[PDB]
Amino acid sequence: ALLRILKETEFKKIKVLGSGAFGTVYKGLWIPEGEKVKIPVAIKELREATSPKANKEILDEAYVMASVDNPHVCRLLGICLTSTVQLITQLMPFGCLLDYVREHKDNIGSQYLLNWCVQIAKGMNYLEDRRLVHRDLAARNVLVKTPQHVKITDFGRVPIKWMALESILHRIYTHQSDVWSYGVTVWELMTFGSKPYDGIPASEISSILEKGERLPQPPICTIDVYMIMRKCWMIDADSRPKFRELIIEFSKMARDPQRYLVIQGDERMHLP
Numbered sequence: 001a002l003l004r005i006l007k008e009t010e011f012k013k014i015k016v017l018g019s020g021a022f023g024t025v026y027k028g029l030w031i032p033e034g035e036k037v038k039i040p041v042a043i044k045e046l047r048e049a050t051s052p053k054a055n056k057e058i059l060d061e062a063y064v065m066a067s068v069d070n071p072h073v074c075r076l077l078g079i080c081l082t083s084t085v086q087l088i089t090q091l092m093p094f095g096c097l098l099d100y101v102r103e104h105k106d107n108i109g110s111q112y113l114l115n116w117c118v119q120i121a122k123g124m125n126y127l128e129d130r131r132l133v134h135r136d137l138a139a140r141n142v143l144v145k146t147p148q149h150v151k152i153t154d155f156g157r158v159p160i161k162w163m164a165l166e167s168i169l170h171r172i173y174t175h176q177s178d179v180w181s182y183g184v185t186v187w188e189l190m191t192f193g194s195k196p197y198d199g200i201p202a203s204e205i206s207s208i209l210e211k212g213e214r215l216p217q218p219p220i221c222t223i224d225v226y227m228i229m230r231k232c233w234m235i236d237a238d239s240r241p242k243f244r245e246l247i248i249e250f251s252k253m254a255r256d257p258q259r260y261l262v263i264q265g266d267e268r269m270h271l272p
């Protein structure tokens with residue numbers, strides 16, 4: 001739809017959820033003016049976003065973030081402009097998928113893991129169709145609406161260990177560098193939220209990658225799943241899968257989960 005211009009009296013902050021590079025995120029409640037319905041919302045308030053030039057840049061960008069319309073992409077619902085900038089979306093009450101997998105890894109099954117892979121590829125496919133490059137896809141930027149329903153967020157306008165080699169060496173970002181980060185995102189899921197390249201400093205990653213090293217095979221992953229991941233991390237960006245292809249391939253596996261991921265016995269052995 002469109003970006004609603006919200007009045008500060010329309011919504012209240014309830015709790016601080018976090019704070020990042022951009023600002024502070026709060027849980028809140030939004031009662032649309034006129035309406036009787038009360039919508040739980042997440043509200044991000046930017047730090048020092050007060051310059052005229054950035055104010056216009058932010059508004060222009062916000063219009064585009066409010067224009068996405070897909071079940072697996074978070075949409076910006078509105079903005080509130082006062083002394084500060086506040087960005088409002090619907091609250092995803094289960095929080096981010098990275099945290100969710102770390103919390104629930106003792107009970108997460110193969111059907112859920114592979115469906116999350118499908119859903120993220122579907123929302124990434126939609127952004128590709130909208131000509132929107134993500135630049136920071138990671139399990140921490142996938143939110144959980146319900147255990148069965150995830151949505152991508154914080155896309156649009158340095159996470160070295162998620163970044164395609166070209167992005168690291170040349171600052172090139174395209175849909176194909178998004179495909180690489182997708183591969184790393186999937187690895188995070190299949191490892192139940194392990195940290196990629198753990199203990200290796202960021203400063204070394206381009207070298208390791210140039211030498212041709214890559215994240216290892218997650219123990220529950222069958223070879224065909226690991227192949228998809230390996231394919232996302234080829235040097236030649238045009239050799240990597242396309243999001244449309246990833247939808248098909250993971251959809252096929254989701255039809256037969258137990259064939260493609262094996263989650264059995266000693267879960268201490270499910271870690272890379």
Ligand SMILES: O=C(Nc1nccs1)[C@@H](c1ncn2c1CCC2)N1Cc2c(cc(C#Cc3ccc(CN4CCC(CO)CC4)cc3)cc2C(F)(F)F)C1=O
Nearest residue numbers: 022042043044049054058061062065074075076087154155
């Ligand atoms: O809203 C967001 N997350 C939320 N989570 C919960 C509630 S809202 C995410 C988000 N990205 C995609 N989507 C969402 C929500 C739904 C889809 N966003 C959109 C978003 C964010 C940031 C800014 C910003 C900023 C900014 C720019 C310049 C300076 C000052 N200076 C500083 C120094 C600099 C020199 O480096 C020059 C510029 C300051 C700030 C803008 C927007 C957008 F697109 F709305 F206009 C951001 O994070």
